[PDB]
């Protein structure tokens, strides 16, 4: 048994992403004595954003990597696992993502011809990137702010406070040196990766709207054709390395900051409340979700959040 797969994201090489999904496809290769042979394609060369999931869609033999509000359009109770300001750990998150209620969205998902490998190669909680001191959404007004090319992410800058401009990272960079957006939003191993700090912005406001993961999507069509002795050496190696990519970036990220704030940036805190309080009318069912979904979800986190205290 023979497969060549394409896996595509928008990521650099410099960034952990993209070295994650290059050590665990060499390791599904590895350890499939080459039956399985991932092959990666780094900032967006192929098929990526909405292009790439659209590819799984479609059927080739194709993996594409992306957060899950990507997949939002096929299967819309994602865009509540991607809603603004639920997690407050990398930790709370992943075990949402272990939890009956994603899995049933993840049969979901399967019933739309989409397998999830992963939905937590974090890359971290993704702050407001600028030349100014942000702390409130007012200080946001007219401010034009990069985001993806995805309503979660439009809907969230626009409830902040800003005027949101969805673009391609390739699109992104030149475009905030020339003023054509006043800034961007990013997780600081994005900032570090992409050398966000050598333009013009350099001020990081903490405002942690989105926690930043990918997920790892292949066509059902494809994924049922693999030998199960097979399927199962990807998904525990898809699985594996997500484990690594968390817990690397949570013992990573003091280390960047000061980094970062070496090469002068500056972090400010910011009014969580308020923001909190702009977010929330985003908490609202759309057509095709699940009935009941952000209580469900807003259940689990208050019972985690119960447990730990408690113990
Ligand atoms: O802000 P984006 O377009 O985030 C997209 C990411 O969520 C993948 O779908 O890119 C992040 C950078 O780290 C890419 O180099």
Same mark, same amino acid.
């Given at each position: 048994?023979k ?6 994201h ?9 070295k ?5 496809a @060499? =390791? ?8 399985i042979?991932?092959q ?7 098929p ?49 993502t272990q939890?009956? #209620?994603?899995k ?13 490998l992963?939905?937590?190669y ?21 401010m ?5 090319? =995805? ?15 969805? #673009? ?9 040196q020339q ?7 990013? =997780?600081?191993?994005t900032?570090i990766?992409?050398?966000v700090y @050598?333009?013009?912005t350099?001020?990081?406001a ?11 999507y292949?066509?059902?069509?494809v ?6 002795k097979?399927?199962?050496i990807?998904?525990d @190696? ?10 690397? #970036?949570?013992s ?7 980094? #970062?704030? =070496? ?6 805190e910011?009014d969580?409340d ?12 759309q057509?095709?979700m699940?009935?009941?979904?952000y209580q ?11 447990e730990?205290?408690?113990?």
């Open positions: 048994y497969l060549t797969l394409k896996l595509s928008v990521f650099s090489p410099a960034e952990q992403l993209s994650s999904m290059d050590a665990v @060499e =390791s599904i290769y590895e350890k499939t004595d080459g039956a042979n991932i990666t394609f780094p900032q967006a060369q192929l990526a954003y909405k292009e790439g999931v659209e590819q799984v869609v479609r059927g080739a033999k194709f993996i594409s990597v992306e957060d899950p509000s990507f997949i939002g359009d096929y299967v819309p109770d994602f865009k509540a696992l991607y809603a603004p300001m639920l997690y407050r750990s990398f930790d709370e998150y992943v075990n949402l939890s009956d #209620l994603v049933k969205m993840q049969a979901e998902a399967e019933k739309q011809g989409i397998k999830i992963a939905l937590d974090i890359y971290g909680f993704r702050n407001l990137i600028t030349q100014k001191v942000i702390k409130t959404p007012a200080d946001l007004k007219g034009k702010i990069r985001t993806p090319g =995805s309503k979660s992410y439009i809907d969230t800058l626009t409830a902040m406070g800003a005027v949101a401009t969805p #673009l391609p990272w390739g699109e992104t960079l030149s475009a905030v003023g054509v957006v006043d800034g961007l939003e990013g =997780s600081e191993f900032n990766g992409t050398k @050598e333009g013009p350099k001020n990081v903490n405002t942690r709207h989105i926690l930043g993961t990918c997920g790892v292949i066509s059902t069509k994924w049922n054709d693999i030998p199960a097979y399927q199962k990807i998904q @190696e898809f699985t594996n390395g997500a484990n690594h990519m968390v817990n690397l #970036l949570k990573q990220h003091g280390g960047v900051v000061k980094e #970062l704030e =070496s090469y002068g940036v500056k972090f400010n910011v969580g308020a923001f909190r309080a702009a977010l929330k009318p985003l908490y609202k069912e057509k095709g699940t009935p009941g979904i469900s979800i807003f259940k689990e986190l208050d019972a985690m959040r119960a730990n205290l408690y113990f």
